[PDB]
Amino acid sequence: QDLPGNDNSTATLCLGHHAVPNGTLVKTITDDQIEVTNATELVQSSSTGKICNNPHRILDGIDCTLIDALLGDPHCDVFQNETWDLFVERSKAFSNCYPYDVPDYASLRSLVASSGTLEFITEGFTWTGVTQNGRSNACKRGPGSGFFSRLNWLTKSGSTYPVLNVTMPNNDNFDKLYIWGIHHPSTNQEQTSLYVQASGRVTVSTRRSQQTIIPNIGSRPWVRGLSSRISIYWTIVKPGDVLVINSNGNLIAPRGYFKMRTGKSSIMRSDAPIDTCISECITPNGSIPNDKPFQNVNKITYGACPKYVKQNTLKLATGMRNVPEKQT
Amino acid sequence: QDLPGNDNSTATLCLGHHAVPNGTLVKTITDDQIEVTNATELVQSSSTGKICNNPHRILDGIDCTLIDALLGDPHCDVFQNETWDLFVERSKAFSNCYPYDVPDYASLRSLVASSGTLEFITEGFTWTGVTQNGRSNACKRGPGSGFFSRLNWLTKSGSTYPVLNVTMPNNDNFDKLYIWGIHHPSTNQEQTSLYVQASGRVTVSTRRSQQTIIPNIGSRPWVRGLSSRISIYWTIVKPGDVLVINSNGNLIAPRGYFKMRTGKSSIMRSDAPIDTCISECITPNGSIPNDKPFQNVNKITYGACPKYVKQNTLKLATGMRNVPEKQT
Amino acid sequence: QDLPGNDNSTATLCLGHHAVPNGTLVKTITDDQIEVTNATELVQSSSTGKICNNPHRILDGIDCTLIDALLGDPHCDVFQNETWDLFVERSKAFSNCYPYDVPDYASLRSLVASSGTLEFITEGFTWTGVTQNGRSNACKRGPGSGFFSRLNWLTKSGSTYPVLNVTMPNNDNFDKLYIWGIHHPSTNQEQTSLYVQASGRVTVSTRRSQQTIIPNIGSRPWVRGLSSRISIYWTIVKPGDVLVINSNGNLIAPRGYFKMRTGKSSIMRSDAPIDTCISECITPNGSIPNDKPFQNVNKITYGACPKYVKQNTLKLATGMRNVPEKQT
Amino acid sequence: GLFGAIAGFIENGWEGMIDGWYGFRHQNSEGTGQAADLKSTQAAIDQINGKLNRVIEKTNEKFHQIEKEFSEVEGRIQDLEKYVEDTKIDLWSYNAELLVALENQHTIDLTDSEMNKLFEKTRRQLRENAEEMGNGCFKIYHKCDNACIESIRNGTYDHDVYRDEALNNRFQIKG
Amino acid sequence: GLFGAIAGFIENGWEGMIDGWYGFRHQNSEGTGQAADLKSTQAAIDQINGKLNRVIEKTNEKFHQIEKEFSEVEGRIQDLEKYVEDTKIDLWSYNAELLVALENQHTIDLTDSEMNKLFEKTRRQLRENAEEMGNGCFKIYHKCDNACIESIRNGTYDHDVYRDEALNNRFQIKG
Amino acid sequence: GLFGAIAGFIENGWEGMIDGWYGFRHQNSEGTGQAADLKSTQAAIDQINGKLNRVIEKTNEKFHQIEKEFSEVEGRIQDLEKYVEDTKIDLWSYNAELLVALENQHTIDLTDSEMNKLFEKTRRQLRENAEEMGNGCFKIYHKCDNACIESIRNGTYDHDVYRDEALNNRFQIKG
Numbered sequence A, B, C: 001q002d003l004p005g006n007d008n009s010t011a012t013l014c015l016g017h018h019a020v021p022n023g024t025l026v027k028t029i030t031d032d033q034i035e036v037t038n039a040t041e042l043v044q045s046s047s048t049g050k051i052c053n054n055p056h057r058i059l060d061g062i063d064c065t066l067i068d069a070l071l072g073d074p075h076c077d078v079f080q081n082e083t084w085d086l087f088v089e090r091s092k093a094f095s096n097c098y099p100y101d102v103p104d105y106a107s108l109r110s111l112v113a114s115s116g117t118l119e120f121i122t123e124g125f126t127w128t129g130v131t132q133n134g135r136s137n138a139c140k141r142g143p144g145s146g147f148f149s150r151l152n153w154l155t156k157s158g159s160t161y162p163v164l165n166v167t168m169p170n171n172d173n174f175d176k177l178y179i180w181g182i183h184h185p186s187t188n189q190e191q192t193s194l195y196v197q198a199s200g201r202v203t204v205s206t207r208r209s210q211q212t213i214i215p216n217i218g219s220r221p222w223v224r225g226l227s228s229r230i231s232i233y234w235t236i237v238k239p240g241d242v243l244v245i246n247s248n249g250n251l252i253a254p255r256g257y258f259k260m261r262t263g264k265s266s267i268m269r270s271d272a273p274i275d276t277c278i279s280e281c282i283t284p285n286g287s288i289p290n291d292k293p294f295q296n297v298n299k300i301t302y303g304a305c306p307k308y309v310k311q312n313t314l315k316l317a318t319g320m321r322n323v324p325e326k327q328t
Numbered sequence D, E, F: 001g002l003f004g005a006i007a008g009f010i011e012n013g014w015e016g017m018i019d020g021w022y023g024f025r026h027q028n029s030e031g032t033g034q035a036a037d038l039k040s041t042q043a044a045i046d047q048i049n050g051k052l053n054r055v056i057e058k059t060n061e062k063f064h065q066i067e068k069e070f071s072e073v074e075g076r077i078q079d080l081e082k083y084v085e086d087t088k089i090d091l092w093s094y095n096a097e098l099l100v101a102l103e104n105q106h107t108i109d110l111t112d113s114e115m116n117k118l119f120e121k122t123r124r125q126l127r128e129n130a131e132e133m134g135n136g137c138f139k140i141y142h143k144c145d146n147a148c149i150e151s152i153r154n155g156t157y158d159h160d161v162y163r164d165e166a167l168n169n170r171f172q173i174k175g
């Protein structure tokens, strides 16, 4: 080997691991605070406060709700034929036309909201024997009276309101959404003045369905000078089917159809400012970053978003246990 | 160092762990019965059989359902202005007044049940031209006929029932719940005898909504001597809005409003006895202790309760594997 | 002690584990592809393409939907008194009798579908003063006109339609399902021709409930030569209760009751072929084997089936890490 | 379990040890003795309690919810009310079943671990003066009276004090 | 994995061992051979089967449920029917994904564990007569014919029988 | 954690080691020195990143859903809308809470494991030339200059080169 290898010394080698002065507490199966070298937060808890206008198509409703934009309230005429990935409805929106109510408001708002378009096609309905284009001073369009742009109020001609019986075939290859309504007069006098018959009736049908609504006379609270109301209804007509509108008084007739589509559109109630930035996840509180897996900003979201969770903090340990060597 | 240790012997040291004679079987990722030293049950599977009357405010409905307590069936007059955290409805409850039906019974029972109060404020409605306080022998109050304490049955005065058109503003800063109804006569003779007009009509509205109900004449099955029915409806009036009741016959008028609140109240169907004890978790089977994480007593609960689970036993090992030394 | 005698040498013993040339990649808490010796698939992703007719009782609806089989469309008379564990509805099914609509079609289809029986008992209703058994050329039974086998169309006798007021007690100890309807005429002339009264009315009630429907005159789209419609309604009568049918025109009367039961029956829309084989899990895509825990064939299932999952493959490692001698 | 001490190289437990979960039995110049080890007993117990407390952490409370029992047949909406609840119960039942399985599996490996750690710790301390008989017992190759056994147990044993006595006894012999 | 035997101190597997999952390879003065160890092979297999069977334990059955495909547009209630099912499917998909991840992670550490336990067990048995070459092989410092190798494998090896031969060979040498 | 190296037989960490997670300090002929071990540092880091990436794998996207805030009181259907969402949130919250608890528990045992594997690996290499002082340090019984320390660290140490020097120093002495 060598010869008498006599140098009798020894050495010491010690293994160890790092430690940091700071360190983070994390939860465990057995401990709920144990300190580790480093951790990463998994719950997104803050919004920018602004809805980024990119990548989704944000349509700001300004002072229009989506249903008034649909019906064509004069002040929402800005939105005709408009489209959106997300329609934002603001708390300040107001209606300002003939007082109306929508029996299942909630479904019509949904159904339009996810169709994502207000594209309107006018169709040639021929109403023979009645006066068309009725308007009201509670729905001012410009200096004059007015009514919803997408609806057509029929009243008597001379001394008669005939039984209207019109039909419109769906010959295209897409579904057609028709919005129509019925006018509820305040007094029997109002009823006969406008529609002659002392009891109106509207029946709208397809091969598949039918709705017959009869009006209801009576005073409601004064809203924009009126005690009357109109109630809004809708009918989808499938390709190849046919719409038949049959009425004997009180019909608020459709002027054509909205076309329907299938997409990723939806509506959101939010007073957050829209701003220019790209962000995939939208919350009524503004956009948030979807880099973390969970979020605690809001349970309402649109887009690629973290899963909402009740916790506002969940730290994932990304390091070993911190066992400091003093702590400095 | 030390001197001659004449004797040089050895020692034996053995490490080991305890074991118990008994031991419990638990499930594992790899075994479904492995025996451990000790375990703890995680599924609560038994009730006391009694609903503790503390800490929540239990209101025992005795032989009244909540809707009859609301309407004011004579025999439930005990509950006027009463309040609860949990209203218990008993299987024995019975109605004993004018036969009525409630179109969306389920929502009205819910809506009242979580409001948690039957506080009624009487309001000064003025019904001009009709006879007030109509009553019936199927709703005996004391020796005499009677009707629901919270409703007011209007019939004609002399030879006329006018068109009633009343209004009541919500000037307070809380929502007001109005319960009202319509009487469906059995015969056209009954209709004209009571309401003169051969076709009644009730329209109740606010700035936001309207309901018009028309009665329906016809015989129903004899219930407490009658074939007629009354159907119950409800209208909430928000602060600043206004109620307008307009009718031309058949109106069962409101006498004021119930006030609504927002709380932790609910209703429960149970024949369990109420008893004095404190217990946070209530089940239709009686209270149970929420010391364990899961329970198998009932999927219906109120209060701070264990999560219902299909399993009736889940043992958490709280000790090592039991490896005893004797045979079996 | 033991005496070596002569030899002086050593030995080498090495421990190791197997490896395979092939090997499967699996996901892990720390890796998403790590290669193991062997794995087993947990997601069932393929169907046979055929609905096995065993063990559940499959009833193939052929060209009848369940509601037409219920009502008794001539062409579905094959299904009278039929029963099923799963009724399969085909895309080709068509109706071919008097044009009808069912207000809550969806609940009536459900309610019948899980009752699982079309057992019909005829009851002796006596309609005095009207012409029974009305039929129509849009519902041909054989060479002649016809109507639904389970419904009875009443029209006037001579010059009068009386007020019908009939009753049928539930004296049995089971619930009775009554299917009835109302005829909506196209013209007021049709109304008076058939029912004399210019406004019909149907009220069907029990001690617990009541429905009054009034017909609606007007033209609907031509379907099998007609613009009129009939709308279908249902009433369940509990043991001890009593049905009272009261009408003054337009009643499409029941001929008896369907009996109801409680079971594991349901309905499925599928064009998959029924075939002879035993399979517990049925999917609209055909039966699938429930040997794996999860499946990706369809979210719609009937029977003992794997849990539907978005993933189409999840491999469970059933062996150690594969560390081969050469490569993979 | 994962470490193979309990129900592994240590053949079985001691039903006689009533004063702790892990411990020592010895035989020496002065006789035989048993004694629980309280540090590893506390380490195993604290971990299991910690685990336990996390499982019993807050029953959340719920007030008005949906109806879950119905007396009439209604169709579409009641079918949904029933489906929401039935899928809620199966999801929570899956959770409870998987939670106690992971938990228990871990409790068996954790207690296996503490046994093995106590063994390794004792091994380390005896240094060159003992050998492992492979059954959880060490053969201590030097005279070790009751106070010596107590110093191994309370962790103050100095191997140097016995190293030459031990190395002689252990190796030299006749080969 | 956690124990660092498989894909760790044991460099790689043997594609040639077809008779078991774990085993022995030896070289002595009489030749070289291979042999699977069936006890650890069975221990690994039983645990993985146990795990497997728990996963395939009962598909629950469901009969009438809610509609999950719709042909008309209805609004509020159909939106709910769709949301109940979509949130049900994502919750069950999360469960399946997490379950096989935990499961697989554990199957790799468990088989790592058995390899290491077989190594430790053999180490313990050879006592002072062998040294660990650090790559999963022991250098046995005494003449060990095929019957001696068989006794180590079947666990009847008596170290005492070779201790002085081994200790001489191992230490003495010239330092 | 399970292996009892970190916060176990290794008393505490070194706040001074800034160049890696695990490593060596030595004191020898030329003085004292420290050095991180990059292979175990990388092994721990890769595993934690792998775990991390799996957790941040795809936020799924959702578009039209159900309403979750309401301004009027409606009863039955709105009660259901609220109950579907509230039971969805509690189920996802349970999932997030359990996931980080399992995850963290495993990250602490994994890093414990790598420390222990580096220790065992060094033990194996020094063979008969060092003894374990039981606190994570080896006493190397032969002259080992800075190049010798570097060969242990970079894994090229040949024990044979020092075996007789070491065995002499270690055993012989005077007992």
Ligand SMILES: *[C@@H]1O[C@H](CO)[C@@H](O[C@@H]2O[C@H](CO)[C@@H](O[C@@H]3O[C@H](CO)[C@@H](O)[C@H](O)[C@@H]3O)[C@H](O)[C@H]2NC(C)=O)[C@H](O)[C@H]1NC(C)=O
Pocket: A187, A219, A220, A221, A222, A227, B165, B166, B167, B242, B244
């Ligand atoms: C039925 O009863 C209702 C409630 O009493 C009557 O409504 C009230 O009718 C008056 C007269 O049209 C309304 O007055 C107008 O109010 C506005 C705002 O104050 C003001 O600018 C006008 O100069 C006028 O005062 C009053 O607002 C209205 N109130 C409500 C709550 O609707 C209704 O007129 C009655 N109808 C019949 C036919 O008897």
Ligand SMILES: *[C@@H]1O[C@H](CO)[C@@H](O[C@@H]2O[C@H](CO)[C@@H](O[C@@H]3O[C@H](CO)[C@@H](O)[C@H](O)[C@@H]3O)[C@H](O)[C@H]2NC(C)=O)[C@H](O)[C@H]1NC(C)=O
Pocket: B187, B219, B220, B221, B222, B227, C165, C166, C167, C242, C244
């Ligand atoms: C329409 O048809 C129904 C059913 O046939 C008739 O109902 C029945 O009417 C009679 C006479 O009012 C009821 O008689 C009562 O029986 C009870 C005992 O149950 C008795 O205490 C009363 O003094 C009286 O005699 C009978 O119960 C009732 N049955 C049902 C099921 O309602 C109804 O009268 C007919 N209406 C007309 C206007 O034709």
Ligand SMILES: *[C@@H]1O[C@H](CO)[C@@H](O[C@@H]2O[C@H](CO)[C@@H](O[C@@H]3O[C@H](CO)[C@@H](O)[C@H](O)[C@@H]3O)[C@H](O)[C@H]2NC(C)=O)[C@H](O)[C@H]1NC(C)=O
Pocket: A165, A166, A167, A242, A244, C187, C219, C220, C221, C222, C227
């Ligand atoms: C109300 O308006 C509707 C729509 O214009 C009218 O419906 C149409 O009525 C005609 C005459 O009955 C139907 O014609 C028949 O069609 C079949 C199939 O082509 C054919 O065999 C007959 O010889 C005849 O042509 C037409 O199909 C029908 N169309 C629709 C969409 O229903 C209805 O007649 C009007 N009613 C009144 C009272 O004015």
Ligand SMILES: CO[C@]1(C(=O)O)C[C@H](O)[C@@H](NC(C)=O)[C@H]([C@H](O)[C@H](O)CO)O1
Pocket: A134, A135, A136, A137, A138, A145, A153, A155, A185, A186, A190, A194, A226, A228
């Ligand atoms: C109150 O006067 C007005 C109005 O609203 O301004 C005038 C208006 O020209 C008239 N329009 C038509 C088509 O009749 C309308 C209706 O009579 C009333 O709205 C019935 O409710 O009334």
Ligand SMILES: CO[C@]1(C(=O)O)C[C@H](O)[C@@H](NC(C)=O)[C@H]([C@H](O)[C@H](O)CO)O1
Pocket: B134, B135, B136, B137, B138, B145, B153, B155, B185, B186, B190, B194, B226, B228
């Ligand atoms: C049958 O006799 C009674 C009754 O119920 O006891 C007498 C009662 O004074 C009368 N009350 C009123 C306000 O008219 C009531 C109605 O006429 C009947 O309920 C209409 O349905 O009828």
Ligand SMILES: CO[C@]1(C(=O)O)C[C@H](O)[C@@H](NC(C)=O)[C@H]([C@H](O)[C@H](O)CO)O1
Pocket: C134, C135, C136, C137, C138, C145, C153, C155, C185, C186, C190, C194, C226, C228
């Ligand atoms: C068009 O002619 C028919 C028909 O359907 O074939 C003739 C048929 O005998 C007649 N049946 C009865 C009971 O009246 C029916 C109704 O009048 C019509 O359907 C009302 O809608 O009309």
Ligand SMILES: *[C@@H]1O[C@H](CO)[C@@H](O)[C@H](O)[C@H]1NC(C)=O
Pocket: A038, A039, A040, A318, F052
């Ligand atoms: C803590 O962990 C996160 C995620 O692994 C990482 O980005 C960060 O740099 C780490 N911190 C340090 C000081 O290493």
Ligand SMILES: *[C@@H]1O[C@H](CO)[C@@H](O)[C@H](O)[C@H]1NC(C)=O
Pocket: A080, A081, A119, A120, A121
């Ligand atoms: C809306 O779009 C349709 C289809 O191109 C078009 O015919 C119509 O005139 C448009 N109207 C408005 C107001 O943009």
Ligand SMILES: *[C@@H]1O[C@H](CO)[C@@H](O)[C@H](O)[C@H]1NC(C)=O
Pocket: A045, A046, A047, A284, A285, A296, A297, A298
């Ligand atoms: C988000 O918005 C809701 C409702 O507007 C509010 O209660 C919540 O605290 C907000 N959270 C954040 C992080 O902004």
Ligand SMILES: *[C@@H]1O[C@H](CO)[C@@H](O)[C@H](O)[C@H]1NC(C)=O
Pocket: B038, B039, B040, B318, D052
């Ligand atoms: C069994 O475990 C439970 C919970 O840890 C504890 O209360 C009980 O005392 C234990 N049993 C014994 C005998 O230690």
Ligand SMILES: *[C@@H]1O[C@H](CO)[C@@H](O)[C@H](O)[C@H]1NC(C)=O
Pocket: B080, B081, B119, B120, B121
């Ligand atoms: C109910 O409470 C209101 C409010 O204080 C009171 O005015 C009313 O008279 C009370 N009535 C009864 C019967 O308690």
Ligand SMILES: *[C@@H]1O[C@H](CO)[C@@H](O)[C@H](O)[C@H]1NC(C)=O
Pocket: B045, B046, B047, B284, B285, B296, B297, B298
């Ligand atoms: C609780 O009550 C339900 C319904 O009353 C019953 O089926 C169940 O078995 C009861 N369970 C217990 C533990 O009392």
Ligand SMILES: *[C@@H]1O[C@H](CO)[C@@H](O)[C@H](O)[C@H]1NC(C)=O
Pocket: C038, C039, C040, C318, E052
């Ligand atoms: C792979 O695993 C499955 C389930 O354990 C088993 O049936 C199959 O035989 C295994 N493959 C091999 C080659 O062992």
Ligand SMILES: *[C@@H]1O[C@H](CO)[C@@H](O)[C@H](O)[C@H]1NC(C)=O
Pocket: C080, C081, C119, C120, C121
């Ligand atoms: C249906 O079954 C009932 C009950 O046995 C029987 O009376 C009836 O006549 C049957 N009808 C047919 C068409 O099978």
Ligand SMILES: *[C@@H]1O[C@H](CO)[C@@H](O)[C@H](O)[C@H]1NC(C)=O
Pocket: C045, C046, C047, C284, C285, C296, C297, C298
């Ligand atoms: C099952 O059927 C659905 C709808 O028919 C289809 O989209 C799906 O891809 C099919 N899957 C299989 C495995 O057949």
Ligand SMILES: *[C@@H]1O[C@H](CO)[C@@H](O)[C@H](O)[C@H]1NC(C)=O
Pocket: D147, D148, D150, D151, D154, D155, D156
């Ligand atoms: C350990 O045991 C020895 C003998 O009993 C005793 O002298 C010593 O003080 C003990 N040390 C401790 C810390 O108990």
